[PDB]
Amino acid sequence: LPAHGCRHVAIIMDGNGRWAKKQGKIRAFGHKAGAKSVRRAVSFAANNGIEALTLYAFSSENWNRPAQEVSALMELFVWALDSEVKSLHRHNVRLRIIGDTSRFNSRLQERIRKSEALTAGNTGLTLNIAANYGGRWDIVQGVRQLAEKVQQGNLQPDQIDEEMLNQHVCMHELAPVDLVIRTGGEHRISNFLLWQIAYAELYFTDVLWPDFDEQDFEGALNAFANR
Amino acid sequence: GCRHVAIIMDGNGRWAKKQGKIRAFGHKAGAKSVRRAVSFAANNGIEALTLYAFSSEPAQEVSALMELFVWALDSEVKSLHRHNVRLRIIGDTSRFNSRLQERIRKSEALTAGNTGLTLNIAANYGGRWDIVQGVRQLAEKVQQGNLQPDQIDEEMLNQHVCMHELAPVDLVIRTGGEHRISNFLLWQIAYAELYFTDVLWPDFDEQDFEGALNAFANRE
Numbered sequence: 001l002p003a004h005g006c007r008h009v010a011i012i013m014d015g016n017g018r019w020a021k022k023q024g025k026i027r028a029f030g031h032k033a034g035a036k037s038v039r040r041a042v043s044f045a046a047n048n049g050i051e052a053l054t055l056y057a058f059s060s061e062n063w064n065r066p067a068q069e070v071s072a073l074m075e076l077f078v079w080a081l082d083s084e085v086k087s088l089h090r091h092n093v094r095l096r097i098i099g100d101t102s103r104f105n106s107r108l109q110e111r112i113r114k115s116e117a118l119t120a121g122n123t124g125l126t127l128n129i130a131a132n133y134g135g136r137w138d139i140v141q142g143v144r145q146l147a148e149k150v151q152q153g154n155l156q157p158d159q160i161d162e163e164m165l166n167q168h169v170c171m172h173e174l175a176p177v178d179l180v181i182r183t184g185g186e187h188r189i190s191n192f193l194l195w196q197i198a199y200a201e202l203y204f205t206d207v208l209w210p211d212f213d214e215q216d217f218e219g220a221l222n223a224f225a226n227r
Numbered sequence: 228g229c230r231h232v233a234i235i236m237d238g239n240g241r242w243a244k245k246q247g248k249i250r251a252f253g254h255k256a257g258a259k260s261v262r263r264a265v266s267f268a269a270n271n272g273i274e275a276l277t278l279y280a281f282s283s284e285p286a287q288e289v290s291a292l293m294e295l296f297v298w299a300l301d302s303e304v305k306s307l308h309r310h311n312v313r314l315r316i317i318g319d320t321s322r323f324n325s326r327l328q329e330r331i332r333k334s335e336a337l338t339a340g341n342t343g344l345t346l347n348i349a350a351n352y353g354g355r356w357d358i359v360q361g362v363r364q365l366a367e368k369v370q371q372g373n374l375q376p377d378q379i380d381e382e383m384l385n386q387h388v389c390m391h392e393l394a395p396v397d398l399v400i401r402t403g404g405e406h407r408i409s410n411f412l413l414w415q416i417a418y419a420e421l422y423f424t425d426v427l428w429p430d431f432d433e434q435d436f437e438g439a440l441n442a443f444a445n446r447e
């Protein structure tokens with residue numbers, strides 16, 4: 001019920017590399033600065049009445065990039081889980097990872113499993129980290145779930161409707177996505193959420209993610225409130 | 228090289244109000260704009276042009292609309308044909324009366340062989356509805372026991388969504404000022420460039436359309 005009236009924001013956090021290069025700095029510095037930015041956005045959202053914040057962390061397509069780039073991201077994901085989870089919990093933040101977790105090594109899966117569990121009963125902001133995630137993959141998984149009900153004999157094809165598949169895509173349990181923000185200048189979804197953004201406001205800014213701060217977040221919320 | 232362009236044509240009503248006229252007037256103007264956009268796409272080598280006509284979303288005024296569609300086909304198909312355009316309608320048409328469905332089939336039949344622009348007219352279309360249709364197909368095969376839930380993957384499902392036979396959509400344009408897809412193509416826009424403009428549809432012209440291709444040409 002906050003004034004901007006936005007309940008679920010989703011973010012494509014692009015620009016980190018470009019941010020570091022403008023400065024003559026290597027890829028890694030932009031990742032350092034991007035993580036600060038994630039801490040800043042998460043905190044902003046918990047403080048401004050947002051119900052859910054969904055961040056595009058690692059796409060299923062990203063696996064096809066230089067090892068130094070994959071492992072760095074993985075490295076940072078492992079670092080966040082091992083060291084930022086206690087703070088999410090102390091903020092009554094509920095953490096969910098969305099995407100094909102089966103591909104991660106069983107040890108990364110165990111950290112994911114424990115982090116979600118620790119925080120599953122939290123009632124504040126729901127933080128969804130999309131890791132090894134894709135909008136098409138997401139739809140495909142809800143499809144197989146349905147197929148399955150058709151296989152066990154409980155579902156009839158002709159009964160499958162929009163509402164039913166809407167109940168089996170990731171985050172079906174949260175308020176619908178009201179606002180998609182993409183930093184970094186590019187104007188495309190890039191196989192981020194697709195089913196879920198049917199009615200979302202799409203908001204593109206050239207600000208590089210490491211520079212995207214609380215004032216830019218208000219900006220985007222205000223542009224949304226004026227829709 | 229932009230091969231497939233998709234347009235959400237919003238703004239006819241606001242353009243009418245803005246000109247001080249009734250909604251029907253904006254629509255005549257909007258129609259004139261469709262013609263102008265189709266030509267521009269054709270004279271510019273675009274291979275596919277998909278237009279969002281009406282969403283699934285007085286049982287009388289629907290009728291007047293089914294008759295308009297008929298009117299439009301009857302008056303404009305000869306021209307699309309001379310201009311070597313292949314016409315295709317996407318959307319849930321089972322819902323249309325018998326006469327309009329047959330008129331749609333003869334028009335597609337008449338232009339299937341054309342080798343220029345493929346013009347897709349989305350009538351009673353929904354992005355979610357599209358995926359659902361593919362899903363139902365897939366579900367049927369599973370029921371007959373010829374497909375395990377585990378064998379369904381993106382590629383398989385993609386073969387069951389509208390326009391899977393054509394070049395992927397590269398650019399989605401929405402005139403009118405709103406910044407949303409509005410349940411227009413969903414599955415198909417995963418990688419498309421998204422272009423929003425405040426120009427109302429009736430006013431959208433050749434230069435606006437080029438501006439959009441320019442915005443596409445400049446994507447990284």
Ligand SMILES: CC(C)=CCC/C(C)=C/CC/C(C)=C/COP(=O)(O)OP(=O)(O)O
Nearest residue numbers: 013014015016017018034035038057077080
């Ligand atoms: C666990 C977790 C999700 C932590 C948050 C830290 C964070 C925002 C990392 C950046 C990830 C990313 C997309 C890097 C690639 O550079 P780039 O594609 O962003 O930038 P570029 O277009 O300029 O090369």
Ligand SMILES: CC(C)=CCC/C(C)=C/CC/C(C)=C/COP(=O)(O)OP(=O)(O)O
Nearest residue numbers: 038039042043077080081084085087088129
């Ligand atoms: C995969 C994964 C776990 C991703 C999330 C990573 C991340 C950086 C989350 C931010 C948590 C947050 C807002 C902490 C606040 O700092 P604080 O608790 O130090 O206390 P403060 O509000 O007073 O600064």
